[PDB]
Design a protein around this nucleic acid. Structure first.
Ligand SMILES: [K+]
Ligand SMILES: [K+]
Ligand SMILES: [Mg+2]
Ligand SMILES: [Mg+2]
Ligand SMILES: [Zn+2]
Ligand SMILES: [Zn+2]
Lengths: 468, 468
DNA sequence: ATCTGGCCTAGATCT
DNA sequence: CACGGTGGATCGAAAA
DNA sequence: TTTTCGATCCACCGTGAGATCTAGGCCAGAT
DNA sequence: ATCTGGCCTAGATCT
DNA sequence: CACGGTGGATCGAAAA
DNA sequence: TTTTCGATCCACCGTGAGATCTAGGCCAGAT
């Protein structure tokens, strides 16, 4: 009937960041100027705004939180993606999988102390191993689906609780159904900040490995993220700690503390290396930690690997192995896809050269996972393990929330303001809606060392400054 | 050629409060959706945006201020008003007068301490004594033309200086010219806050009157506002002070301080009346003033006349005269047009009854002007002497400035940010452009005493809460 | 065993 | 510190 | 030889996220 | 005439 | 304190 | 008996303007 369907009038209503009064006056002005058939009435705008929303028996909002039963959220997603983005019957019976990735990160608000929001972005819709739907910008806020949030300060406690709830809700849900098609789901946990990577990674450094219980007895459990968390998520901290053991034990060619005369000299070396690091680069190190195991910021681990030569000279760990750790962690943290066989052989040779540089000191668990069993988990998931919003992207999504809380919710009962935040965080995410953020500025790419670009593939949609 | 002329695409661009990127994406999206002939290109948007701007040899912006030579501003105004809002040759030679009113008021910003902006709103365009153009909402920010501003704290000093500059620039300018029509100008100063009314009114209470040098020798000088300022602008303060003299002299039936035994009892009465007022209503009074003549806030004068009965009992001034002062000041402050003969006879009878209530105390100068020569100045100007933005209106105009400073200027050299503020404060004012603010809420009208509504005419465009 | 007394975490302030 | 966002200046292609 | 059209520049000011400094509640020496 | 000492104006905080 | 601004709920007219 | 259309409601949260409280520089009693 009209030029703009409701499904595109909505896209306009979002991209221009328009209020209800603003859209109503826009359409009314276009009408008054003689043209009559361009902008759907708000009635239809909202009648599509409803098909963007899940069944209201599943959206549970309270004055403190808003939770969408993941089942309904995934049903909604796989319904919208079809409803517009596939010419139907392109496949008749081929299996469908909506490969998606989720997570959360608190962000202060400058009461509403700091939002803490689970989040979900549909990455791809694959059929029988073939692509039907691809996300044009997997690090852009275009497709951030909210699963739940609540205005609680992001302690370790609220994080561990929310992760427990969400990781059981994930195990629960059943494949979704749309127009005679039975779509299964695959969710990974990669929307993790650094702080949260510490809060979750610091359960304990456990002395085991599942595959190694050399040969393999193939039995795998990929779910609940524990594999990815322990192996590669923001292992950097552990790595800086792990090697540091050697940086102290550099005297007696062993790990234990049972020796006589080993321990006093070992303590003194810890002393002097900590004094050296404190005087040359002013970075606090493991020397002060009493709770939940030895732990440091991501600040210290990053600034450790931030320059290979300087700290490599400092610690006495010869510069080449620190070069290798810096480059492989640069690969993980980079945000680009990991080429399986090249990264795998780089890691295998790094392992070989490392063990033949230090064989007295056996393989530390976290590093043993990162290097030996490292690449095959990027393989079995085909993921970007750091995959999460860019600096400009997370900045835009947090400004999205602050806008939808301050300008696009209704200042009533408080059940409603959170209800509208949740609404617009679905609408603005709808895989069905065209949505145009202003064009980014071309930034010089993240300066990378001379041995990583072969591990990455720089045909890219990302432009972050300090992380990715 | 296209549905929206540039002159209406601009109206849309403003009313929706749209940025340049937002308008460009709006038009581009409408284009991409198949319709091609609706939204002018930004090139034409801006080519009309130029005809909204005065000749750039007159806009003088510096890192501290922005001043438009009033001549150019009035030329621009009388050009735009014709260019769209008159079917030409409706009159061929009849004289033209753009009756306008101006003023200023500082407003803090919550560096950019507080803007202090001259302002101008074209009220009417009259021809040979007949209306051609009428302002639909003379208290709305729709037509606020900026003459100059500068980010300076609003002392009495900057105000008196800016008023001197503007009142000489007004005397200077020459009738404007548009398409064979020679338009003269008439500007009044009514865009005055209360604070500014004090800062200007407190030159001195001078012992004279021009008409009275009983009969009249007709010689009049209406310009420079001095008449309106001294006579009726926010005289209320003076009135509360003037009568207060009697409220002290209630003992000896005279004005002077030469008596013996008069003065001590007079001081004691001042004491006790000040103690009574301080204990019953907690309002500070004239008793403490050492500089620039006796002066009080508008707070105290208003709260004085805020209830007739209570303070009327307190002061000993019989309640009826205070009823009359309250009602006539309510008329001035009300914001509604003043019916000349009814208001005039009300004031004449108030004068008669007052002098026959207190004749010992001669007519104080400010009150003598307000009541005896009072109405004829509303006559010779046909004005709303309080005419100035409403609460919601001034709130919207100050939010206009904060928006055009924070969102619609360019963050460059600072010559430019002020240049764009000035631009959009002209554009958003253009008498040529349709501009739709969101619809106001119906408020209960300002509660008025039972003898004023005959002085006002409540066929109204105004909806303020505390002032008008 | 008490009396205050040098440290380990949240707000405030850089960058 | 880094980046986003301002609206005009400027330039080249194009329209013609 | 004019207008129109689009992209890019200009360059700084807020903002904001991460990252550093600064104030109050708890296990060792003397009675 | 000096030495500090009770008041009259700007920022901060209600409403 | 007062008012503006939120987007949906609800209702009546209307479309038909 | 459905959809569509418009206006009005819901009612509270920021904001903001005016209006109140709170900290530093100047003319009288003793040397
Ligand atoms: K940032
Ligand atoms: K107000
Ligand atoms: Mg975080
Ligand atoms: Mg003012
Ligand atoms: Zn293993
Ligand atoms: Zn007179």
């Amino acid at each position: 009937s009209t030029i703009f369907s409701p499904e595109k009038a909505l896209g306009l209503l979002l991209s221009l960041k328009l209020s209800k009064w603003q859209y109503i006056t826009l359409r009314e002005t276009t009408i008054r100027e003689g043209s009559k058939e361009i902008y759907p009435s708000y009635y239809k705008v909202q009648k599509a705004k409803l098909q963007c929303y899940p069944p209201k028996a599943f959206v549970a909002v309270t004055d403190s939180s808003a939770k969408i039963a993941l089942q309904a959220l995934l049903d909604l997603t796989v319904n919208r993606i079809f409803e517009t983005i596939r010419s139907p019957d392109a496949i008749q019976n081929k299996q469908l999988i909506l490969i998606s990735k989720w997570g959360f990160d608190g962000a202060s608000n400058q009461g509403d102390s700091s939002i803490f929001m689970t989040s979900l972005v549909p990455l791809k819709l694959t059929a029988d191993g073939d692509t039907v739907w691809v996300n044009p910008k997997p690090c852009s806020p275009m497709y951030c689906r909210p699963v739940q949030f609540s205005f609680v300060k992001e302690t370790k406690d609220v994080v561990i609780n929310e992760k427990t709830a969400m990781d059981d809700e994930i195990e629960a849900l059943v494949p979704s159904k749309c127009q005679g098609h039975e779509i299964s789901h695959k969710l990974m946990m990669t929307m993790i900040d650094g702080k949260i990577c510490t809060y979750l990674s610091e359960a304990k450094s456990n002395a085991a490995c599942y595959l190694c219980l050399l040969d393999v007895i193939a039995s795998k459990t990929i779910s609940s993220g524990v594999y990815e968390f322990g192996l590669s998520t923001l292992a950097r901290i552990n790595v800086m700690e792990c090697l540091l053991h050697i940086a102290y034990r550099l005297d007696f060619k062993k790990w234990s503390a049972r020796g006589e005369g080993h321990q006093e000299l070992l303590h003194s070396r810890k002393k002097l290396i900590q004094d050296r690091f404190k005087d040359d680069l002013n970075l606090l190190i493991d020397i002060v930690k009493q709770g939940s195991g030895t732990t440091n910021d991501g600040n210290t681990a990053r600034r450790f690997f931030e320059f290979p030569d300087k700290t490599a000279a400092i610690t006495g760990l010869d510069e080449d192995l620190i070069r290798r750790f810096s480059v492989i962690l640069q690969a993980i943290t980079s945000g680009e896809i990991i080429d399986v066989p090249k990264f795998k052989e780089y890691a295998r040779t790094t392992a070989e050269k490392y063990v033949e540089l230090y064989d007295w000191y056996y393989m530390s668990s976290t590093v043993h996972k990162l290097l030996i069993h490292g690449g095959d988990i990027i393989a079995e998931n085909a993921i970007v393990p750091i995959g999460s919003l860019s600096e400009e992207a997370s900045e835009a999504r947090n400004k999205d929330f602050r806008r939808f809380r301050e300008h696009h919710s209704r200042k009533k009962s408080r059940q409603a303001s959170n209800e509208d935040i949740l609404n617009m965080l679905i609408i603005s995410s709808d895989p069905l809606i065209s949505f145009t953020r202003p064009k980014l500025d071309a930034h010089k790419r993240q300066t990378y060392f001379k041995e990583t670009v072969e591990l990455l593939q720089l045909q890219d949609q990302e432009a972050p400054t300090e992380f990715h």
